[PDB]
């Protein structure tokens, strides 16, 4: 029995939510159930609407001032609760019993294929609120929906839509390429793989690279990089890349020789703090959050969904230096991308509010 109460700046309205992280099972999102406690004497026959909002915050580089972010709604839901016109939940029943008759429950259904709470990593020169997808619960006292919402009689509470790692392990990632360098002498074979499909945050990613060279060229270097893909659709569908981990190895493969090694790299935020625009997980206010989890989407998906979609790939690159007709300045790189899932496993308690200086 632990619930969150936030009163209005004056103190008449108060929202009561049980959770603040609502797990998005791909079929259905957990209902945003709550309870609003009102004071008829102050309201004077007004209404108490409760709004659930999904808003994409963004910045402008044209403005002379800095930190002036904006908001761009992509889901709005409204519920009138004081004149009530899908029964209550056990938590709602308990709150109503403990608060009497002047507590009026509300519930929200978040439709599937909505974005999860993602925060883009702000730069060090930024001084405003971060960008990304943020949810919010807002209850206010207003006679009309269109009437101005004076902040004195409204309560804004941030909530996070989250996902957790699927229980069933997926197929092992694996890719292979063959490249011929304008000679057709023999195929340069590259094969890479990862041990598993789903990785938890902080765990090492074991890349088993297997190069089988048959050509007459020398593989100078092998670079393994973990890259984060962010599909942001704020105004037009875009795509971004960011290496969150990288291993540069001087391992050399001679012609007609095979090379096998297992490279281990771990993505983490310590070495990626200066990358502005990096996708992190949703932030309640301004706490430290890990790299954004992979976005799980339905097998039958509407696609092109708004907000930010996070993906991760491991890239292995062979830097082959051409010989016999150049000064080794040219380097025809053969490469391979392997996708994997980076999530948290299903918990048994609330994620946040553990440690704070």
């Amino acid at each position, epitope marked *: 029995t632990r619930v969150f109460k936030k009163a209005s700046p004056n103190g008449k309205l108060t929202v009561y939510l049980g959770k603040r992280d609502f797990v998005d099972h791909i079929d259905l999102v957990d209902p945003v159930d709550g309870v609003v406690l009102v004071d008829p004497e102050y309201l004077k026959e007004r209404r108490v609407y409760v709004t659930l909002t999904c808003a994409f915050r963004y910045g402008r580089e044209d403005l002379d001032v800095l930190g002036l972010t904006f908001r761009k709604d992509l889901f709005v839901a409204n519920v009138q609760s004081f004149p009530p016109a899908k029964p209550l939940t056990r938590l709602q029943e308990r709150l109503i019993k403990k608060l009497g008759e002047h507590a009026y429950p509300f519930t929200f259904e978040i439709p599937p294929n909505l974005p999860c709470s993602v925060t883009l990593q702000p730069g060090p020169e930024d001084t405003g609120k971060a960008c990304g997808v943020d949810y919010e619960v807002k209850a206010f006292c207003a006679e009309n929906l269109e009437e101005k919402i004076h902040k004195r009689n409204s309560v804004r509470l941030v909530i996070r839509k989250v996902q957790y790692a699927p229980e069933r392990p997926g197929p092992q990632p694996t890719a292979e390429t063959t490249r011929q360098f304008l000679m057709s002498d023999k195929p340069l074979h590259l094969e890479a793989s990862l041990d598993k499909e789903i990785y938890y*945050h902080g765990e*090492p990613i074991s890349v088993n690279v297997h190069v089988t060279n048959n050509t007459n060229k020398t593989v100078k270097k092998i670079k393994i990089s973990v890259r984060q893909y962010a599909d942001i659709c704020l105004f037009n569908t875009a795509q971004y890349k960011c290496p969150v981990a990288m291993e540069e190895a001087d391992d050399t493969v001679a012609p007609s020789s095979t090379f096998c090694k297992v490279y281990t790299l*771990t993505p*983490f*935020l*310590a070495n990626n703090r200066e990358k502005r625009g990096l996708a992190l997980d949703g932030k309640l206010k301004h706490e430290d959050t890990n790299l954004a989890s992979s976005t799980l989407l339905r097998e039958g998906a509407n696609r092109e969904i708004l907000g930010i979609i996070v993906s991760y790939k491991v890239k292995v690159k062979l830097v082959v230096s051409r010989g016999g007709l150049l000064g080794d300045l040219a380097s025809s790189d053969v490469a391979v991308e392997l996708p994997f899932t980076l999530m948290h496993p299903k918990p048994k308690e609330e994620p946040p509010h553990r*440690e704070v*200086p």
Partner: antibody
Amino acid sequence: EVQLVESGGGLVQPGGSLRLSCAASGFNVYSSSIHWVRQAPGKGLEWVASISSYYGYTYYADSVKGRFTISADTSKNTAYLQMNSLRAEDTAVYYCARSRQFWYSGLDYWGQGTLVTVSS
Amino acid sequence: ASDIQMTQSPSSLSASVGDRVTITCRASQSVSSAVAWYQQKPGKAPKLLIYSASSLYSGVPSRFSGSRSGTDFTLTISSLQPEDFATYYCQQYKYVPVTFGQGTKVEIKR
């Protein structure tokens, strides 16, 4: 097998230096935090230093900040603690403990402990 | 939170096999449910008993149970065995200067 093995504790001169090492096993330094907790002979538990190593954080006690320094070596999966300007009140049995990095605390794994004796 | 004192009420406690004992700790300031409990045999490393002020760590026998009421916290041993003679520490982990309780020695009486 998840275990922490400590080393480097021993008798030193007052004002000297020491370097305790916590050789972790069975877990990774990026998915867990490493903390140093000491217990004076016949006294209670006390937290000294901690390192996150995923967010690159290092925390020290109010009486430890200006002398101690905790560090993590990912290659060997080991954490250290540089104890300097040691005084009399630094005598204790020092334990290194593991905590889950992501949304957990309560030190679920502990080392055996190494007694650090600081007397002239 | 300048500093938080995890004051355990009983310093020494005498009990018998099969008895029910309770150890109460008071925080100097609200720490939410960020409280853990440890069992330390003499000359050994502490063992985590319960965390989140109510949640039982895996492998710890069900006779141990913790519960929060307010700024106070409670660890319960129901029908304590002879293998429960130890010192019990309460730790709040809500803030970086993590503080433990003074400890409570639970001894067998006769």
